[PDB]
Design a protein around this nucleic acid. Structure first.
Lengths: 49, 185, 52, 148, 52, 58
RNA sequence: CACGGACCAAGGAGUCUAACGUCUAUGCGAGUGUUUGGGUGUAAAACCCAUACGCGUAAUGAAAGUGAACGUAGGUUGGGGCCUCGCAAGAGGUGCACAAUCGACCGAUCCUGAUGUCUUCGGAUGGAUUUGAGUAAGAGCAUAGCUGUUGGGACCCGAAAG
RNA sequence: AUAUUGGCGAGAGACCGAUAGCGAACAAGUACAGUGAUGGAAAGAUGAAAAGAACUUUGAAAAGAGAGUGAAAAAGUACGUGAAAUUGUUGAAAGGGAAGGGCAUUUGAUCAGACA
């Protein structure tokens, strides 16, 4: 299926690629988990910074 | 029935009005549809159809090209007009005084023009200063310097630079691009 | 000079306090831009949905 | 937005824009680039000249670090000066005081000669230069220090 | 201070408020003036008599 | 299952739809194919006559 | 006197995405892209931001490598527009974009081969019916939309098989 | 720091709304089929509240017919609304080997608007 004038495109989907899709919906939900654990550890560790 | 030498109901293929929804844009299209009609001078009729131009058909006119047109004999006192955006060119280390009237200036070309004792204008003030167009220069920016036009008309022996993702060795330099592998073009 | 907006107290009762316009209020008003930016920004709080 | 698509204008027409004779079927011309020598040849020639074959030497374990050499024409080379200080150097341009432009600080690997810096003497530090690049610098009254 | 002005700048890094692509927003105010109504030709009747 | 192989019917009629456009020929045609010996001299003929006025025009 | 359809209701077919071409709108513009992350918050939003990094601004050879002004960034034909004269008609001056065309500049290939030298290195100069997806006062980057393509179950349904 | 279609406990959505959403909103891996591995459905809704029809009569009874309950049985455990195919009754019109359609007007039935 080659037609018209188009750049050749190598797109590697010939495996089963939908099993392995990782979408990040937690980008903002892991940011607060990460700011917690830093404030957890800020207190735990005493004035050690 | 009628025997037509032409195709019927066939539009002219022009911009009767911009495709933009911009409000302040349409206030100039409103201002120059008035002057183009009643002022009898072709300048207004030229600036009107230049407000309808799409983006790709509006390349920016650098502040260096403005200095050439002033070196152009007799034009050092003219008020250059650019329907489009003026952009900065620092490769010129001197700039004249004069005046410029354009839709949009970049923040760099605003300083440079103001820096020399010159002045930046809008199109509306030009209509008030010179409705007929007295003592003006229109200037267009280069249209065919685009990256896509470099690819227009690809085909054998036309030297048009194929559309391609990656540039380097091993990408479409081999069979048909040189005599040693196969043929050339 | 700016228009000098006037200051009002909490009982009503405006006052000798009158302030300049911040000049954010002079900016162009672009309902097509606001419409394109809104339509996109309003999509940023959403959850996925998919059938099993 | 699917309210704007053209298959929401094709509701009611039988063949949905794909034609009634050739229909629309799965893969008429094979998957992907298949047949590129054979039935798509006329396409590969004209719009992909040079596709097939091998040009020159392989390079094992290539690293783009070795090859990092950004280029800065004499067109600019005055941009690297602070625009507040810059017009101090243009006017009152003499030796015994000359701007030291470190082009590696700004991420440039070579100073090319594309054209016409002004007449102000300038000290230009660079890793690499070109034969025309210095001639214009050195004739402007400046020099090129090499660095590593 | 947040959006800046001509005197005070930004507090938002690399930002300045937009510029007008037209000075005055009242179009009929320009269309009168002096210099325009001086260069303008005398108007028609705003609706044309049907002839024939 | 033989086919209908060749016909010229309709081809002249398709030809005149956009209808046999012309050379669009230009002043100053391309010197491709011109005598290299004439063409070399012609370089310097024009090269000299441009500077010919550079002595007069100044 | 080809195929499907007794009838009725309800379901029922060009979608999403990754990577791109043209086109259009928008912000800035020799740049552009805040969202991998950090600050913050009325808490998956909104708001603010350091470092890099990606494309772009330089091309060309397999490569080692080298790298863009003889000149108002050139000349000639034509060009919207503007300026001068004239009652006007028209002629003259200037001419952006753009089309043609001949030059100058950088790289590659073949030819020449200077003042010079660790005596075989260096490569000045000068060429050429040669070649490039080049220069010649930057235009691209980001998002959005239509249409088109490639891979994916891929507009829907359907094999004999393995 | 990273991974997670299981487990436990939580909060949410421009998601589906009973032929949809999980196969399963219900005593759903249930009833059922098979020698077995395995296969695998259908099925939501009276009302605010059972107040779910005492009592009378015909009938062997089911029910009918009255009364009765209720805001309403044009809500009677076949139960919210109750479409279409399809059917029974009444009324109207039509009919010489189909029926049905378009243009035109007569006849019959109906309809406003308008005027005044």
């Amino acid at each position: 299926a080659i037609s018209k004038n188009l750049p050749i495109l190598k797109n590697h989907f010939r495996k089963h690629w939908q099993e392995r899709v990782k979408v990040h919906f937690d980008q903002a939900g892991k940011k607060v988990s990460r700011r917690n654990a830093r404030a957890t550890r800020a207190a735990k560790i005493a004035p050690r910074p | 029935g009628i025997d037509h030498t032409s195709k019927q109901h066939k539009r002219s293929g022009h911009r009767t009005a911009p495709k933009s929804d911009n409000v302040y844009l349409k206030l100039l299209v409103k201002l120059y549809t008035f002057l183009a009609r009643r002022t009898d001078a072709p300048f207004n009729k030229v600036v009107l159809k230049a407000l309808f131009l799409s983006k790709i058909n509006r390349p920016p006119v650098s502040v260096s090209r403005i200095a050439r047109a002033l070196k152009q004999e007799g034009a050092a006192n003219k008020t250059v007009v650019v329907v489009g955006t003026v952009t900065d060119d620092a490769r010129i280390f001197e700039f004249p005084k004069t005046t410029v009237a354009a839709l949009r200036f970049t923040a760099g070309a605003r300083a440079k023009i103001v820096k020399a004792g010159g002045e930046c204008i809008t199109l509306d003030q030009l209509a008030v200063r010179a409705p007929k167009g007295q003592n003006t220069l229109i200037l267009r920016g280069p249209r065919n310097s685009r990256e896509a036009v470099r690819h227009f008309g690809m085909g054998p022996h036309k030297g048009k630079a194929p559309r391609i993702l990656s540039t380097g060795r091993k990408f479409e330099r081999a069979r048909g691009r040189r005599r040693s592998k196969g043929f050339k073009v | 000079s700016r228009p000098q907006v006037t200051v009002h107290s909490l009982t009503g009762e405006a006052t000798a306090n009158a302030l300049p316009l911040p000049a954010v209020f002079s900016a162009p008003i672009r309902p097509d831009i606001v419409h394109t930016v809104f339509t996109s920004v309003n999509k940023n709080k959403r959850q996925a949905y998919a059938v099993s | 937005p699917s309210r704007f698509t053209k298959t929401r204008k094709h509701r009611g027409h039988v063949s949905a824009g794909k034609g009634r004779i050739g229909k629309h079927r799965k893969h008429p011309g094979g998957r992907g680039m298949a047949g590129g020598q054979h039935h798509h040849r006329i396409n590969m020639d004209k719009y992909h000249p040079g596709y097939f074959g091998k040009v020159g030497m392989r390079y094992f374990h290539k690293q783009q670090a070795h090859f990092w050499k950004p280029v800065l024409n004499l067109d600019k080379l005055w941009t690297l000066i602070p625009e507040d200080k810059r017009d101090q150097y243009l006017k009152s341009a003499s030796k015994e005081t000359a701007p030291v432009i470190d082009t590696l600080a700004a991420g440039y690997g070579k100073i090319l000669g594309k054209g016409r810096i002004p007449n102000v003497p300038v000290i230009v530090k660079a890793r690499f230069v070109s034969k025309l690049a210095e001639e214009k610098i050195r004739a402007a009254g400046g020099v090129v220090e090499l660095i590593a | 201070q947040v959006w800046g002005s001509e005197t005070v700048a930004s507090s938002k890094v690399g930002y300045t408020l937009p510029s007008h692509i037209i000075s005055t927003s009242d179009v009929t105010r320009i269309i009168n003036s002096s210099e325009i109504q001086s260069a303008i030709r005398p108007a028609g009747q705003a609706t044309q008599k049907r002839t024939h | 299952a033989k086919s209908k192989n060749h016909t010229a019917h309709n081809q002249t009629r398709k030809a005149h739809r956009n209808g046999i456009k012309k050379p669009k020929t230009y002043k100053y045609p391309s010197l491709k194919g011109v005598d290299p010996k004439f063409r070399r001299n012609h370089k310097h003929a024009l090269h000299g006559t441009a500077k010919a006025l550079a002595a007069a025009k100044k």
